[PDB]
């Protein structure tokens, strides 16, 4: 498994022990063979869990999520998927790791897809070995894989709005439920309806994940309302999963704007990962999985695969060569390899708009490729009237860095900058020149 020129997919079912049992064995063998190794965690929460399973082993934690004193002699590095891709893009020397281990390798965020493409290209070239750890490899068609204990699967209508009647089974439950919703806004409505009925609810999403996940272990709760981020190795002490079976899909229209389409069906991989939250304790059979729709291959034409190509086109590999996407997920986008390659100055602006600007990859690319510098925000206000960003049914307004009140009307409209109150707040600060 650790021999050069080989990519292995460790596809044990959810809860089979990939992270707590297999991962330490692989690390011990890699250190014995003196292989310079990278361990890639999807989130800071998973990085903290990996430190518990690897505790004592000489691993260098390149994250502030772990408070450890490194000896300086570690040959095994651990960092998040995004950090790896970020360091590849930046003018920082990244070691040419002999062994590349990716945990939760089904993660479909652009930086995870780009990391898989880069690593799999190095393996194809015969320069490295790689191990992708996931119960649901790219292309899986089984939404009901094996579990540690039997699960009661039930197809049922699941509410996506507040309800006054017709869903007694939801509140007539004395255990703990994890509920996957298609968006932050949809979760807010269900959480308020559940709170009004006397339930204690915790809400999780990409931006609030590390802080709010702590509350699932520090306090008593009845429901966790979460977006698709909890498919990435997040574990709960629950006995029921309610799954809407729906997600939002970013879609690029005519190469000029990004909309959040749907809600629409999740992939079979996503459904299996959501269901996989329960049935994990062999001593507690009977966990329930209630699902509200079917699965579909909605990753085809999803903006994240296009954004992954924008990232890989700007990562140095060898001379003019460019890393391809990982073969099983390469048909999800119809881009020309190298079509997003930027010149040195524009590439630096592209990186900074993502790293400091916190802009989506697609939007960062439109700005940098237009020859606009990082601190130049005139583009946030000179778009067409149909690009007006709306806040509570009235045009959003900001004071520019010049002291003038202006309506937010970006030249390129990416729906992810205003998909929720928190996102629009961060975009307003960016348009105002506050970061
Ligand atoms: C993959 C493909 O269809 N090409 C494409 C799609 C959308 C955009 C937006 N900006 N550049 C683009 C290039």
Swiss-Prot record:
Tell me the residue ranges located in the Lumenal compartment per UniProt: 1-435
Chain positions found as N6-acetyllysine = 207
Q: How does it sit in the membrane?
A: Peripheral membrane protein
For the ligand (ATP), the binding residues are 12-19
Return the annotated region ranges for Important for RNA-binding.
3-6
According to UniProt, where does the site described as Involved in NS3 ATPase and RTPase activities lie? 274, 277
Domain Helicase ATP-binding, residue spans: 1-155
> Taxonomically, which superkingdom?
Viruses
Localization per Swiss-Prot or TrEMBL: Host cytoplasm; Host endoplasmic reticulum membrane
Its quaternary organisation is: Forms a heterodimer with NS2B. Interacts with NS4B. Interacts with unphosphorylated RNA-directed RNA polymerase NS5; this interaction stimulates RNA-directed RNA polymerase NS5 guanylyltransferase activity. Interacts with non-structural protein 2A. Interacts with host SHFL; this interaction promotes NS3 degradation via a lysosome-dependent pathway. Interacts with host CEP63; this interaction disorganizes the centrosome and inhibits host innate immune response.
**What is this protein's function?**
Displays three enzymatic activities: serine protease, NTPase and RNA helicase. NS3 serine protease, in association with NS2B, performs its autocleavage and cleaves the polyprotein at dibasic sites in the cytoplasm: C-prM, NS2A-NS2B, NS2B-NS3, NS3-NS4A, NS4A-2K and NS4B-NS5. NS3 RNA helicase binds RNA and unwinds dsRNA in the 3' to 5' direction. Leads to translation arrest when expressed ex vivo. Disrupts host centrosome organization in a CEP63-dependent manner to degrade host TBK1 and inhibits innate immune response. Inhibits the integrated stress response (ISR) in the infected cell.
According to UniProt, the name of this protein is: Serine protease NS3
In terms of the parent sequence, the fragment covers 1681 to 2115 of 3419
